[PDB]
Amino acid sequence: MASIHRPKRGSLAFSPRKRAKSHIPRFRAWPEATGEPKLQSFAGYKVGMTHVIMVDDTKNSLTQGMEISVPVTVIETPAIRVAAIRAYAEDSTGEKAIAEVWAADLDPELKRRIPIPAAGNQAEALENIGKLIEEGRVSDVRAVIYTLPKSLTGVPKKVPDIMESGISARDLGTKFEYSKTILGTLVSVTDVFKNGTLVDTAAITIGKGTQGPVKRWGIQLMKGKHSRQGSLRQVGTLGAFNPSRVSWRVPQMGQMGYHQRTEFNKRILKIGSDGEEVTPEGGFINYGLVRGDYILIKGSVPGPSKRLIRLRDPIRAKKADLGEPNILYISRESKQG
Amino acid sequence: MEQRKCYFCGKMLEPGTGKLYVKKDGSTYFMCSSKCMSNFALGRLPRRTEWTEKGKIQLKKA
Amino acid sequence: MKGMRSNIPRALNAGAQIACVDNTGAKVVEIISVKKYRGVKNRMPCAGIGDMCVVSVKKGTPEMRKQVLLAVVVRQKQEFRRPDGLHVSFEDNAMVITDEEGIPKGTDIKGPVAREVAERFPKIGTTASIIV
RNA sequence: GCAGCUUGCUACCUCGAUGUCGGUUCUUUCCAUCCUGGCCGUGCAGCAGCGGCCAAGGGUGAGGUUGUUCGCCUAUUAAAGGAGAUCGUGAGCUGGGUUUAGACCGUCGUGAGACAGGUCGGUUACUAUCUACUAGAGGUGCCCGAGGUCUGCGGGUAAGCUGCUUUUAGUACGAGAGGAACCAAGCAGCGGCGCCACUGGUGUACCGGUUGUCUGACAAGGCAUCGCCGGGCAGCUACGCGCUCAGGAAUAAGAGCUGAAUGCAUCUAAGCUCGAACUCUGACCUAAAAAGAGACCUCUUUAAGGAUUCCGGUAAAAGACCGGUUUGAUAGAAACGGGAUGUAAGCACCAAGGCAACGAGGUGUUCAGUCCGCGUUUACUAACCAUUCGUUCCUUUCACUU
RNA sequence: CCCUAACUGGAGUCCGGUGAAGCUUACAUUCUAGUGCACAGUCUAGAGACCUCUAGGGGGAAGUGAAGACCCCGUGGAGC
RNA sequence: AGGCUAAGGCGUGUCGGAGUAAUUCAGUUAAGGGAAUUCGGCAAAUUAGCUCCGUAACUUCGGGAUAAGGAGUGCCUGCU
């Protein structure tokens, strides 16, 4: 038999396609430190999409210098609290948590997530971590941070979300000093990301529940006469006669969406403080209006509205210093029109 | 930023939205929405359609 | 080829009988294949504005008819977006006979051409009376 | 000699049936490699060929005839390679062919009838027991009791592949004709992942027009596929939109260094440097049920905290998940904002005309009327009342109390 | 059909009531290779595998339905 | 005929239900292309009543024929 070839339906790069074990994306890698100390990640909540008219500043592009309409995602980004500093020791079996110091004073609504750590050992915990770093038991340092969604109104929840973030510094001592400076403080998104820079966005995608292989993997439907013989939206064959089994690579029904996904190289087009600049007439549908500080991300982002979106400094960015975008018009017309 | 007027309802095309429709004779018409495009393609005239500015002008002519 | 500023949906697939709108003697040409287009299994060859297709002259003069020629689509009813966010659509689909290089066999083009084809092939623009 | 993918030979298995060809759908494998990557030779100037070696990561398409496999032909294309999987795949599909009963033509036969000849027509059964897989849960094990944040034993991946154009450059090369390569840029085809500002579809919410008929007429309504027709918000969706280089290590073929056996020479016998779309790492997903069953911190040990009830939705087939619960805007009402439709009923004037009664319809009242599975404001009603576990149960085999 | 999308009613899915049938020597959480009447979940050597439940399409059980209607044989028949 | 209604006969032969997922039986609609699908336009879609105009090859002179191909159509006022 002389066969016609096709690329495989869907990607096996995301198998098993199960539901994410948490509603928060977890970062498995952190990029290289390339400058002054700072947090490598922030976290906001997706609001919705709008579009801007901007001058194409992208070097070498055909439309560079002319007016272009660019879709943007609005992400409401209230200040996060640096709740703790955690130290990690590297050994043959990998990284292990070795020490943690919690900030002396923490927000009372953190009790919705965890019983509040007391204002106990912070000075001696920090000196213990300093001794550990001096004696070489510490491989690196991360900052445990959490969001404060109570200030938002389109997100109904008041329980904070907690996550670890890397610190970008040239040396472990510099990392420890910066973490001590930022410990217990409220960091704004301008203290993590700058306008016009590329970032990576992680989020839990839109949940679709249980979906068939046609929607879930993009398999072809039965065609022509076969379309009305009783197996229309349904895979042609589960396998060969031998091997006597259904491969895991055969497209099948199952959970669709509500997965963790990372998008790369999303450009920040605006860091705003007043949500009236971006909120349309009538508000964002099912969300409301922006009230705190916000961010405009060029293009689309994984997740629906109100989903927690984690932003991190780019890990596979190609282009060098991009610049500050020239946003000439932010559309606030009614999205419900 | 080109400022464009809807041919049917006479409303300004908001930037990044709207349509331009070209006939065989080179005639160009800006449409603010699918509603205006559909009403233009139905043969309805704006001056007879009341919710458009041309219909409003025709009515206020009296 | 040179990139166009607009995003063009490949609207016309193989078998479409398009009116030919130059003075070459071809009235209706059927798309046979699309140049520089590699497909996938079961997918018909697809062409939008700015694409060059191999066509067969179905109507027109007897000298043009049954000839395999090259044509460039200059008008398409499927809407395409300009870089600045405005969507453009024509009242009909229309093509013009050209060579491999992009030169039109005709001398005048009745009807408006798309600015995308007018820029990708500058001679189509000069041959056309108006560029929309 | 190899393979067993052609056809034979054989008759070991199956005749208390292993459903027969081809196509379609989907998955996988081989390399004897068509293209893509790296090389060597050339009767290799360049362009482009011819021959061979490594390499299976990706690709290998669209169409006309024919049931076809095969083959022929067409236009694209980097190329449109071949083969295995019960000639993969009928408890997936199809039924064109072959392989039933009917009939015709030709040829055999006196005949019934026959033909690896042709032709027309000719039923494709089943509620899944086990196993396998895809997803979702409840337990038990691990474990001070609970919660949170992590690690990564491992698993998977194409953590993309490939063209066109510009430039290099009308340059190297070449007498000319012709005509490259490194780097750089953009775009495109296919693939992957996500998203809905824009555009398109749908939108049996909703709004309007109108046909037939019924409720006595008007108004308001029922029915006729949502009666039909036009429009359409939210939502979903693609025909729309965003993102989707690498670098390093170690290698294959191969090219070299040093270097003896073999005073010299030698890429090889040790040793050493390079060297691919391969492999590994690296930017992705998953992963304490990793039995070596993990690390850290916090809280609290009749507690922490969990579940149930309540109001919900970023979630959802059941479960589960994520939130709020008066110290509250979770949902609903009211109003307003923002939208959909298209100017309501009644009233007045006009109306072709009619002696009049009437009069389709037009204009004003009136961007009206109706509606909103969106937002805001607002505790106005409902998030109240509680239950249950964290105690082996009865007991005084008690850390207790009548 | 390219290439599928949304929606409508009935099933399905979840709940209350009612309530059959068909495969079944046994055991059974399997996978690879070999062996074996040369087409193994059970043999041999490895590799995996904590149990239970729900949904789902049918890879396998050479699945079930049926003393093969093709071929041969029977000094078995029937019709012509 | 079909639709909507009388009279007369009936609600008579399982319910509920939280998006009530995927899938499936039967339907509505679908941008651009329009048979490229497929053995084959199978299925689906197009046209459709009545009036008027007009109607070919061929023919056994009967027909072909509703050939083909065009135009009109509602309501109101007054009439022949």
From Swiss-Prot, chain A:
Keyword annotations: Ribonucleoprotein, Ribosomal protein, RNA-binding, rRNA-binding
**GO molecular function annotation:** RNA binding; rRNA binding; structural constituent of ribosome
The family database entries (Gene3D superfamilies) matched by this protein are listed as: 3.30.1430.10, Ribosomal protein L3, domain 3, Translation factors
Query: Which SUPFAM superfamilies does this UniProt record tie to the protein?
Result: Translation proteins
The record's annotation in InterPro entries points to:
L3_arc_euk, Ribosomal_L3_dom_3_arc_sf, Ribosomal_uL3, Ribosomal_uL3_arc, Ribosomal_uL3_CS, Transl_B-barrel_sf
Annotated segments matching region Disordered:
1-20
Give the family per the record. Answer: Belongs to the universal ribosomal protein uL3 family.
Provide the function of this protein.
One of the primary rRNA binding proteins, it binds directly near the 3'-end of the 23S rRNA, where it nucleates assembly of the 50S subunit.
Q: What does the subunit comment say?
A: Part of the 50S ribosomal subunit. Forms a cluster with proteins L14 and L24e.
Q: Please state what the protein is called.
A: Large ribosomal subunit protein uL3
The uppermost taxa in this organism's lineage are:
Archaea, Methanobacteriati, Methanobacteriota, Stenosarchaea group, Methanomicrobia
UniProtKB/Swiss-Prot annotation, chain B:
Superkingdom to which the source organism belongs: Archaea
Zinc finger intervals, C4-type: 6-36
Write down the PROSITE patterns for this protein, in alphabetical order: RIBOSOMAL_L24E
Does the keyword field hold Thylakoid? Answer: no
Binding-site residues for Zn(2+), renumbered to this chain: 6, 9, 32, 36
- Please list every transmembrane segment annotated in the UniProt record, as residue ranges: none
Alphabetically list the UniProt keywords. Answer: Metal-binding, Ribonucleoprotein, Ribosomal protein, RNA-binding, rRNA-binding, Zinc, Zinc-finger
Q: Which cofactor does it need?
A: Zn(2+)
Note on how the cofactor is bound: Binds 1 zinc ion per subunit.
Looking at the UniProt record for this protein, which Gene Ontology cellular component terms does it annotate, in alphabetical order?
ribonucleoprotein complex; ribosome
Q: What are this entry's molecular-function GO terms?
A: rRNA binding; structural constituent of ribosome; zinc ion binding
Tell whether Metal-binding is among the UniProt keywords: yes
* Xref: InterPro entries: L24e/L24_sf, Ribosomal_eL24-rel_arc, Ribosomal_eL24-rel_N, Ribosomal_eL24_CS, TRASH_dom
Instruction: List the Pfam families.
Output: Ribosomal_L24e
GO BP terms, alphabetized: translation
**Gene3D superfamilies per record:** Ribosomal protein L24e (2.30.170.20)
Subunit structure, per the record? Answer: Part of the 50S ribosomal subunit. Forms a cluster with proteins L3 and L14.
Job of this protein: Binds to the 23S rRNA.
The record's family statement is: Belongs to the eukaryotic ribosomal protein eL24 family.
- Name of the molecule in the record: Large ribosomal subunit protein eL24
Organism expressing this protein natively:
Methanosarcina acetivorans (strain ATCC 35395 / DSM 2834 / JCM 12185 / C2A)
Curated annotation (Swiss-Prot), chain C:
**Gene Ontology MF annotations:** large ribosomal subunit rRNA binding; structural constituent of ribosome
**Keywords associated with the record:** Ribonucleoprotein, Ribosomal protein, RNA-binding, rRNA-binding
Q: Which GO terms describe its biological process?
A: translation
PROSITE patterns found in the cross-reference section = RIBOSOMAL_L14 (PS00049)
Query: Which SMART domains does this UniProt record tie to the protein?
Result: Ribosomal_L14
GO CC terms: cytosolic large ribosomal subunit
Purpose of the protein:
Binds to 23S rRNA. Forms part of two intersubunit bridges in the 70S ribosome.
Q: Which family does it belong to?
A: Belongs to the universal ribosomal protein uL14 family.
Q: How does it assemble?
A: Part of the 50S ribosomal subunit. Forms a cluster with proteins L3 and L24e, part of which may contact the 16S rRNA in 2 intersubunit bridges.
Q: What is this protein called?
A: Large ribosomal subunit protein uL14
Gene name, please? Answer: rpl14
